């Protein structure tokens, strides 16, 4: 617990400390191998973005009971490559990135589990799984989106979510070129254990060439032996999880509706307009599993193999709201993956051999300001849990999407090998971090 | 060393690490008590100022010997409270901060080492020198300033440099109406071992009552035994400092300048304008002394002491030059405390048993965005060590200075105690977790 321990004005009541940690600290380093690694990735979950969302659901000294729980702590810088010079590019995006922590190798902006290259590296997910161990995959997002298609998927642009787009974008990967096909094939030949998100959409294409010619990747799926799910109890209903049977889970077309509905963040909306208060989403329908029960069903799931499993869950609709300038929705969804947190960490210190990781894929672009701030972007004044007046800022794009942005920021991590994200780390050391714990072996 | 390990674009080229830390983080943790403890703020230095100085200064995968080299890490937080509602203020500046670590006590923006009903509290420098201790505080900004001022001085306003202000804004703590007095006259009676730093302007003003009445605030420090310099000469030629002869550095009329020139950021300026080279500062001549000379001479002076010392050293233009969208100021600031805390560093490594803290007051309004990006704010292109351009955007302010933000930051520490920077904490912990370090106890 690392809530202020009670009345803030007074001395040591905004402390989160009740004592010396030294011995707590110690008694957190094991060495000893993780049986099981879940990875909990927020895009675009800054230092900012967590701040704001404990601002705004908890209180200032409030305390996320994910988020915030996991004891060991450092800053991690996730620069991508120019892909003509192989210099730093400083301001990365989902595919690179992810591609970063699951290769362990940079690459340029665009690429999945590709080089600069655009050579094939193998993904932690794909190792784990030749070592025997169940994997899972989970995403707010459409499935085909750069961060779960990284664990799955090596293609020259994110662009190529099916067969249409990749004959055009990624000819070198298409089907139909003896390329190993789009991010949706490959995804479907990865054969992941636990596969849950949105992106239904383009499962609806047929395959040009190979032996599911002429079918609907929905049919290949169900040929293939996937069972199909939908919505929040055909997922419940699942008993069972493996290489005879593995599970998809498609419940949107595209990405998966956000928890929390607000106005958009306006010029001058901080003095032009009155604080506004979060209300939750009346457009999202109650068939749509949250992000934590997605991730119920996957450890249940998962947990059943005797030699070990990795999960990856992402809240990815905090970019998204970060991109769109809406505050609310970004701290909802920033709630709604401290839901999953709190899941993965329940499930871990049971077990008493997972490792947890909690960062991002980069920074982005909302900043708490003062509330007389008079900014040139789009800002807006929040109403909260202290019953106090807090102002967020978006100020880096005149364009419809806010930036991105190339601070380093944190990561946290609790369980056996936790020590190896504390200090100053580079994201493709998440990889290596990953790959020891588990004693994994490149082929 | 956390650099890249190699070749950026190959596998396992960005990597930070060179093999599992478990064993190297159980050897950092020590429950023994801190002899000494140095405070390095960074004013402003936020996750994206290191990241935007290490880019450009040592290139992405570059590494800041001092900055970077501090192995137990951790975020915290520094919201101040509103004055009238004792709920939190999200967005704070130096003085309710620094009174935050030196006291252990939350204020008001604007408050110096008072609480929010305006009463008293004892500073870790006061309590240090209490136990006997030797004490030193050291800043590239003017003495008066709210980082060092909160150390020595008690007011109401941070505005309350000298007796002029204080009568007008501090009217009860005015020495002609029964109060403590000034920040300077405070600072005078604090009576700190090693105090070095600009804002000799202030001490040209006469006090208006009390015992040194009539004289100018330099002749009261002469007449009370303290050692003036003003250069960095004779700074070099101060051979002890303690109560008997205590010193005092006065190294400019206001703030010490910087060592980095480059033109202000503008609006569209990555676009309009070329790329930037930032060049040294021709304006500052080399007489006035840098950081980690101020730092190498109190460290020598201080550690004299057989008891033991508190340093605080503040790295002032960091926020300065944030605000005044000046990227080349800002990174050279980054870089000039970078060497301070080398020094520092060096220092508790030998020694053994001295605890060393890198953290910042709040967060800033520099980002680090793609070299396309269009943004309302003020922009700039930068020529990296990479040989690669970086944009920096200030984008929360349409006056003439950007503005701080509440995002929690990075607190990083070594030596004796400095378990208690891990995990998220408050910026009240910091003065509990130098406290006990030092084993100081209460009147
Ligand atoms: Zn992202
Ligand atoms: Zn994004
Ligand atoms: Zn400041
Ligand atoms: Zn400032």
Same mark, same amino acid.
């Given at each position: 617990n690392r809530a202020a321990q009670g009345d803030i004005t007074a001395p040591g009541g905004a402390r989160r400390l009740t004592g010396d940690q030294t011995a707590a600290l110690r008694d957190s380093l094991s060495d000893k191998p993780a049986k099981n690694i879940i990875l909990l990735i927020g $895009? &675009?979950?800054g230092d900012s973005e967590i701040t704001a969302a404990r601002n705004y659901a908890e209180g200032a000294g409030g305390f996320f009971k994910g988020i915030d729980a996991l004891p060991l702590t450092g800053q991690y810088t996730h620069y991508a490559l120019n892909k003509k010079t192989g210099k730093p590019d400083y301001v990365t995006a989902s595919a690179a990135s992810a591609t970063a922590w699951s290769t362990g190798v940079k690459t340029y902006n &665009?690429?999945?589990?590709?080089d600069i290259h655009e050579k094939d590296h193998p993904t932690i997910l794909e190792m784990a799984k030749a070592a025997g161990l169940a994997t899972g995959n989970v995403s707010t997002a459409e499935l085909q989106a750069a961060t779960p298609a990284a664990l799955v998927a090596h293609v020259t642009?994110? /662009?190529?979510? &099916?067969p249409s787009a990749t004959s055009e974008k990624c000819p070198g990967n298409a089907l139909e070129k003896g390329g190993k096909g789009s991010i949706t094939e490959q995804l479907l030949n990865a054969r992941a254990d636990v596969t849950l998100g949105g &992106?239904? /959409?383009?499962?609806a294409e047929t395959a040009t060439a190979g032996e599911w010619q002429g079918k609907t990747l929905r049919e290949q799926a169900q040929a293939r032996g996937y069972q199909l799910v939908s919505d929040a109890a055909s997922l419940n209903s699942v008993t069972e999880a493996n290489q005879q049977k593995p599970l998809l889970g498609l419940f949107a077309d595209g990405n998966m509706p956000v928890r929390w509905l607000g106005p958009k963040a306006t010029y001058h909306g901080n003095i032009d307009k009155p604080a506004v208060t979060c209300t939750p989403n009346?457009?999202?329908? $109650?068939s749509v599993p949250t992000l934590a029960q997605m991730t119920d069903k996957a450890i249940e799931l998962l947990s059943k193999n005797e030699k070990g499993f990795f999960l990856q869950v992402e809240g990815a609709s905090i970019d998204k709201q970060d991109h769109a300038a809406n505050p609310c929705g970004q701290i909802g969804e920033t709630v709604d993956l401290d839901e999953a947190v709190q899941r993965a960490l329940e499930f871990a210190k049971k077990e008493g051999n997972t490792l947890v990781i909690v960062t991002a894929d980069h920074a982005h672009a909302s900043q708490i300001v003062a509330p007389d701030t008079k900014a040139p972007g789009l800002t807006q004044a929040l109403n909260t849990k202290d019953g106090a007046v807090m102002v967020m800022s978006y100020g880096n794009s005149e364009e419809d999407s806010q930036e991105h942005t190339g601070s380093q920021l944190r990561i946290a991590a609790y369980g056996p090998h936790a020590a190896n994200v504390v200090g100053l780390t580079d994201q493709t050391d998440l990889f290596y971090t990953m790959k020891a714990a588990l004693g994994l072996k490149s082929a």
């Open positions: $895009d &675009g979950m &665009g690429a999945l589990g590709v642009s994110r /662009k190529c979510y &099916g &992106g239904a /959409k383009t499962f009346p457009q999202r329908n $109650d």
